[PDB]
Design a protein around this ligand. Sequence first.
Ligand SMILES: *[C@@H]1O[C@H](CO)[C@@H](O)[C@H](O)[C@H]1NC(C)=O
Ligand SMILES: *[C@@H]1O[C@H](CO)[C@@H](O)[C@H](O)[C@H]1NC(C)=O
Ligand SMILES: *[C@@H]1O[C@H](CO)[C@@H](O)[C@H](O)[C@H]1NC(C)=O
Ligand SMILES: *[C@@H]1O[C@H](CO)[C@@H](O)[C@H](O)[C@H]1NC(C)=O
Ligand SMILES: *[C@@H]1O[C@H](CO)[C@@H](O)[C@H](O)[C@H]1NC(C)=O
Ligand SMILES: *[C@@H]1O[C@H](CO)[C@@H](O)[C@H](O)[C@H]1NC(C)=O
Ligand SMILES: *[C@@H]1O[C@H](CO)[C@@H](O)[C@H](O)[C@H]1NC(C)=O
Ligand SMILES: *[C@@H]1O[C@H](CO)[C@@H](O)[C@H](O)[C@H]1NC(C)=O
Ligand SMILES: *[C@@H]1O[C@H](CO)[C@@H](O)[C@H](O)[C@H]1NC(C)=O
Ligand SMILES: *[C@@H]1O[C@H](CO)[C@@H](O)[C@H](O)[C@H]1NC(C)=O
Ligand SMILES: *[C@@H]1O[C@H](CO)[C@@H](O)[C@H](O)[C@H]1NC(C)=O
Ligand SMILES: *[C@@H]1O[C@H](CO)[C@@H](O)[C@H](O)[C@H]1NC(C)=O
Lengths: 273, 273, 273
Amino acid sequence: VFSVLLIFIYLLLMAVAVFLVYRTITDFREKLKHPVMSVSYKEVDRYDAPGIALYPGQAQLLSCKHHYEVIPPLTSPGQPGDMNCTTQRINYTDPFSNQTVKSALIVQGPREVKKRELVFLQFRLNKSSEDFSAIDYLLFSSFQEFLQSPNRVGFMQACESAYSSWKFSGGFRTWVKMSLVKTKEEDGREAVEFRQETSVVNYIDQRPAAKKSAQLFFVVFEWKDPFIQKVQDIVTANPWNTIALLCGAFLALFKAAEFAKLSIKWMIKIRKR
Amino acid sequence: VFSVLLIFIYLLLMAVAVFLVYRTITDFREKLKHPVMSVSYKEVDRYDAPGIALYPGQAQLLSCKHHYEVIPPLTSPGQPGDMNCTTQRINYTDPFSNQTVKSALIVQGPREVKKRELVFLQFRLNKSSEDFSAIDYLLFSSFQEFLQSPNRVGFMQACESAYSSWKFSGGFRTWVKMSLVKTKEEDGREAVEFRQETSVVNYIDQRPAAKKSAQLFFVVFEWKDPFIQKVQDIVTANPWNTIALLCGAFLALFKAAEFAKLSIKWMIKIRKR
Amino acid sequence: VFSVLLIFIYLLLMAVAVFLVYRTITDFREKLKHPVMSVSYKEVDRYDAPGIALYPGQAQLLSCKHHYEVIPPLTSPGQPGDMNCTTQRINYTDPFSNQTVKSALIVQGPREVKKRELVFLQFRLNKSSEDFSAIDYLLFSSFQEFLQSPNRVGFMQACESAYSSWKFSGGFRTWVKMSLVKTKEEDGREAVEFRQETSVVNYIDQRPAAKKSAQLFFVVFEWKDPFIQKVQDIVTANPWNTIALLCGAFLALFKAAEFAKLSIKWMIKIRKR
Ligand SMILES: *[C@@H]1O[C@H](CO)[C@@H](O)[C@H](O)[C@H]1NC(C)=O
Ligand SMILES: *[C@@H]1O[C@H](CO)[C@@H](O)[C@H](O)[C@H]1NC(C)=O
Ligand SMILES: *[C@@H]1O[C@H](CO)[C@@H](O)[C@H](O)[C@H]1NC(C)=O
Ligand SMILES: *[C@@H]1O[C@H](CO)[C@@H](O)[C@H](O)[C@H]1NC(C)=O
Ligand SMILES: *[C@@H]1O[C@H](CO)[C@@H](O)[C@H](O)[C@H]1NC(C)=O
Ligand SMILES: *[C@@H]1O[C@H](CO)[C@@H](O)[C@H](O)[C@H]1NC(C)=O
Ligand SMILES: *[C@@H]1O[C@H](CO)[C@@H](O)[C@H](O)[C@H]1NC(C)=O
Ligand SMILES: *[C@@H]1O[C@H](CO)[C@@H](O)[C@H](O)[C@H]1NC(C)=O
Ligand SMILES: *[C@@H]1O[C@H](CO)[C@@H](O)[C@H](O)[C@H]1NC(C)=O
Ligand SMILES: *[C@@H]1O[C@H](CO)[C@@H](O)[C@H](O)[C@H]1NC(C)=O
Ligand SMILES: *[C@@H]1O[C@H](CO)[C@@H](O)[C@H](O)[C@H]1NC(C)=O
Ligand SMILES: *[C@@H]1O[C@H](CO)[C@@H](O)[C@H](O)[C@H]1NC(C)=O
């Protein structure tokens, strides 16, 4: 009769439900055992003013200007003048060596991503014994946060431990298109990291040869796009979602139990007749 | 008796169901209030022929060739010849300054990603007063779309507003590995953006010194990988999925109501006895 | 009476359930028809020792050292000495031309991402007829896997087909911050690909002019961040999840059928009275 067909259908449905809940529980198990982080992108009209920690050493900051889409031709390269930016100077011991102190010049970065706001910095280093002409730069977010920070020393070391340190060369103009990545760790601590795309442009010096010994450093800092990349694992960042998933698994188990009970009742009814 | 146990179990299950539906509704609320975009990757056998908007200014395009994995040694650098590409020339006023017109040379980009198709371009600029030797380049997709565009002026300005503008230096060969990102905005408008990885190679000039005043620009355009990155928020891009989520929440609320009704019936049955 | 209201409510609920299951089936259809890959990030304490396939040609590897955060000043540039790395030399025919054999020098890469382990390599090429001074480098993962590979020839060709080949220039120090992307293809084959961020630093040669004809190549290999990017489509990589989705759709269809049956029973009860 159709009774055995209904019993088989309900048994198959119970098997389906228990398989589904077991698969969900399993996938939750690999999600917990293998911590994997999801990636998303957030669009924002205006970026928070970042901090650029430059390490000139003996190089002198000739100029620092804010421009929009265009850097006008230099009136006289190698000549200081027209410093229009908020800069700070900090001394902190290196978190790794603990013997050498790194004197950092913090510069407020560009803010208007949609208008391609450019921070153009000009350095001049007359003489050095270093084999390679470079200036180190470390990108951190929220220059105001550093300025408002109490110690201003441990913050710089914590930013040093972050993976946002690069170097730009002398004798070249370095167009840096930086992008922001915010990671929510397992501990919940926010990690701020920077990607960059670099355009290196050769600089042709028309100055008299007598002054050509000095090295000129040009760097242009710019936001690549109004897209902040957020990296976080959904299972760990949201305990409420984990509880919701467990609750849904429990509900699925209960629906499977209800289907099994209906199957048992139908089997009893069939056996009675 | 077991009646009170069953009543407690059903009450707990109703609490679980209402908590689950409330959590889903809440998470939907933060998804709407905080527009966050998901990221996916699409593999395609052959890329659409892109457009490269070069801005030489006074520089003369000596050569433009399509190669496969290998650029043969130059027969004679600094000498024009063997132009084998589809190029266009467009004049459009700059969307920002509105005083300076940007004359752009559009070049069809590489197509075969799986064979590492290379577009090699050679420019020669004999003399200029600019301090920095650079040529600007803007990457947009579907060069055919520009060619088929009616105005060819507003399209160039719209591409200018996009964040895919870089500069390559003279005296160097610039291997550009470009990658395509397609974003579906809140308005639904498609935004085409380009990432790049740049390899700068110094160029050693063995030409006679008398001709060394001229600047040589070499650029190689190549697709990095057959992976187009699509950025879109699932909640907004799919209104059908939003309606489905709301419908599922309503179904969960109804199942909670059914569980509560079963609990009430069991309580009434227990009270009767 | 309220009977018609209940019948309408149940009919609407059945419509909701069938709409939800139809939407799920549809979205599954576009997921299958349009293969789209999800992106995730995995944090690991220590990276697997990668392989760097250098192609010096006639260039002589002067030096290869492992450093931590700092490269000490060079005692004497252009002078060989202090080779401390595990290197291998392999000859394999190019997978594309099949006429030219590419002699590759495989170097073990950095391992400690959290301490910024640096692999610093120094080459010296006294004379060449090539117009552009460059050395090609191909990044693959698990240098041990290559070392343990039986053929060591087909593996190099397979890595050549991968999109992780770049070039670093002579007369410059190239800080390479490499990042690892692992893709699970439709066939299930693992594809290992590398992104990089390049910092090019000009090298000032204080050596006597008589030896300045020789070209010096400096490269620094470093891991950008302890974040491996995994690209895989969930629907295809997990057949169990696909079966679970189909089973859930079947359960939704059955719940819709149950709601319709309850509606029919209520309608019959209303018609009886
Ligand atoms: C540079 O410009 C800023 C903003 O316009 C201004 O606050 C600052 O005083 C200027 N610097 C000098 C030296 O005038
Ligand atoms: C940092 O140290 C240098 C070296 O003594 C000194 O010249 C400079 O004034 C110091 N700056 C600060 C802010 O402490
Ligand atoms: C940090 O500095 C202290 C003294 O200033 C030193 O004893 C310690 O070894 C340093 N930590 C290192 C080098 O890891
Ligand atoms: C050259 O640079 C050094 C570095 O600070 C500086 O002390 C010196 O005054 C500079 N000389 C000239 C002429 O600019
Ligand atoms: C360059 O090559 C293309 C394709 O092979 C061809 O269409 C074009 O006519 C060539 N140009 C010249 C000047 O022969
Ligand atoms: C663009 O303007 C320049 C400057 O007058 C002119 O030489 C060139 O022919 C123009 N090209 C087009 C396509 O209008
Ligand atoms: C655009 O150009 C018009 C005239 O061509 C000018 O009046 C307007 O100010 C410009 N828009 C700007 C500069 O934002
Ligand atoms: C040098 O370049 C300019 C720029 O167009 C060109 O007009 C001139 O003919 C070139 N001269 C030679 C000798 O190539
Ligand atoms: C270089 O250093 C490594 C590790 O310290 C060592 O195994 C190797 O023998 C050294 N090379 C020489 C030539 O001493
Ligand atoms: C590779 O080929 C070159 C050219 O004949 C030879 O000098 C070298 O020893 C070969 N190396 C290996 C490992 O076969
Ligand atoms: C591979 O090499 C063989 C001979 O070694 C040759 O016949 C074949 O054409 C090559 N494959 C190419 C060039 O795609
Ligand atoms: C110059 O480099 C070549 C390339 O191998 C080498 O054979 C030669 O010995 C080198 N000469 C000197 C003086 O280093």
